[model samples]
Target: PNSNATFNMELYNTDLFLVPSPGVFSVAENEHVYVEVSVTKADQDLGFAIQTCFLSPYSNPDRMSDYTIIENICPKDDSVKFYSSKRVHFPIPHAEVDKKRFSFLFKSVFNTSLLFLHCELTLCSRKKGSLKLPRCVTPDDACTSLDATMIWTMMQNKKTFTKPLAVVLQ
Candidate 1:
């Protein structure tokens, strides 16, 4: 049976064995950032993508760059059956002067479904690396977990929807 599937994502430890916060996390430069992404409920395979970009602060307008840092495709441009989950680990690059904020644009779809889903996570570089990953948080966690925002759009032929997932630095 083919139906709509719901997926979830979270920031986790390097090995993806821990979820520090309920779902939100903060980090500094030269630090390793990890995320635990999973399909909590689905009837078919799912495909996803991630695009890293520089987010500009409202206070500064000149330090903004409308460009992408890096783009990633899970399972090499194809969909994979939802069996469990995986960890995504990446190194935080040196913060840009005057514009230290960044974001990861996550896009996903279910079993060749035309409806595209996405999440936008905001991050900032801090001087503290004191935060550590604790017991991992599953999709069933009843804390203040962040959820992705939904985007619906209409196009001529190929329509791609977007969503904004919220996460912040403390």
Candidate 2:
């Protein structure tokens, strides 16, 4: 059965999870930065994409990019990874559906003590058929995921950012 899915904004909550939730948490050594974005909704067949993201120094950004991780659905570098290209939520749950996980594998780097991660997520699903397609762009040839989509509607997109993750250089 094909799904006719549209996001319910009321029920749609794009919650950003840091491996260690931070008000100001210290990140040290060679440990990878784990980030998982979870959306809770009623539609089982729906999909989610962490379309674009950035590492910013500000909590609430006036402009979203400082260092771009996911650009136009393509990862800018090897330091990041997406778990799946799309259909992240199943038609399943946990990391299989209710959540998508990605990681930044940089060893030592930080210009500021207070660093934040901002991401754009799009909700999507297969259609009955329309000229405007709803989907997540798959990157091949060269691909990297911040170890991390669907009908990726503009209005159906949501934004989430983690609180300042205090970087402590050891």
Candidate 3:
């Protein structure tokens, strides 16, 4: 019974990781920055994409990005702090994107202390096509995590930063 197949699902951990990108904090007080939260196509053998935001209170921009237009193969770990491309910067211009997701405070800047704040990346699961096209599959797991730590920071300063951010898998 294909409909009754018990697919072993592995929720993507990379969907909810950290971005301690210096660029995120480098923005001016009157501007906003972007932390690219990753969404992924799940292993189809399991029959669904990992359907959730990296962070709760998932930043909802006043608008949403057309997923069809923004499709790209995000990294397996979904690295956020640094990337193969140059660091994503503050105030991504409307002219720059055909669509957008997540909200931002147009005139509010992230305080440096925000770097120290802890966030929880909760894990969840469900059977596919068992519900609606989009369903709020109950989350059955949780993890508390920190943002990124850079290479120079490890070598340059010791006292200014306390702990290195970590990614934990259960």
Candidate 4:
């Protein structure tokens, strides 16, 4: 039966200004951004979890700046399997600059339909005028711009299920 079934997961990030597009988000320095994970077909309770990590051109992958994951409030039991179509939200503090790539990993053990999902985001700093400081001098005047570049990265050794899709920042 595992060959006939598949796990479909999608990741989304809410805009700082509540913009309708999921690809672009603008936030001031050190602000919070909302992100979510959704499982399309979770047939059983597979120990679903989301984690944040960071990767750079210089060193090994590391944890994100700051984040908080809110566990699902639904009751758990042996006989009951949790299935959530609603996206679960998490808050991540804005990065200081475009130094490292932040990744969000969603993992589950649902009979091997899909084992892991990884989402990566890059934060770019937009200068206001003449201030060369790390933060925006006039916070309200600066707006972050996210280039629309999305790609699907395939995973090795898994051909049946689709690999994770990434929303990248350039």
Q: Against the hidden reference, what TM-scores do the models get?
A: 0.34, 0.62, 0.24, 0.27
Measured by TM-score, how close is model 2 to the native structure?
0.62
lDDT of 1 by residue, 85-162 (tens): 443323353111111111233232112222212322222112223312122222223123343322111322321223
lDDT of each: 0.28, 0.53, 0.22, 0.24
TM-score of 3: 0.24
- Compared with the true structure, the alpha-carbon lDDT of candidate 2 equals 0.53
Better of 1 and 3 by TM-score: 1
Tell me the lDDT of model 4 at 24: 32
Q: Highest TM-score among the candidates is held by which one?
A: 2
Better of 3 and 4 by lDDT: 4
Model 2 weakest 10-residue run by lDDT: 6-15
Ranking by lDDT: 2, 1, 4, 3
Q: Which candidate number maximizes lDDT?
A: 2
Sort every candidate by TM-score, greatest first.
2, 1, 4, 3
Question: Which residues of candidate 3, in runs, are more than 4 Å off?
Answer: 1-24, 39-41, 44-101, 106-119, 125-134, 137-170
Model 4 segments more than 4 A misplaced: 1-22, 55-170
For model 4, what is the C-alpha lDDT against the true structure?
Answer: 0.24
Show model 1 residue runs off by greater than 4 Å: 22-24, 51-170
Write one digit per residue (lDDT tens) for candidate 4, span 14-103.
Answer: 322123323333332233333333332222212122212221221222333222221121111112122222333233531111111112
Candidate 3 structure quality by residue, lDDT tens digits, 90-120? 3533111111122222222222222221111
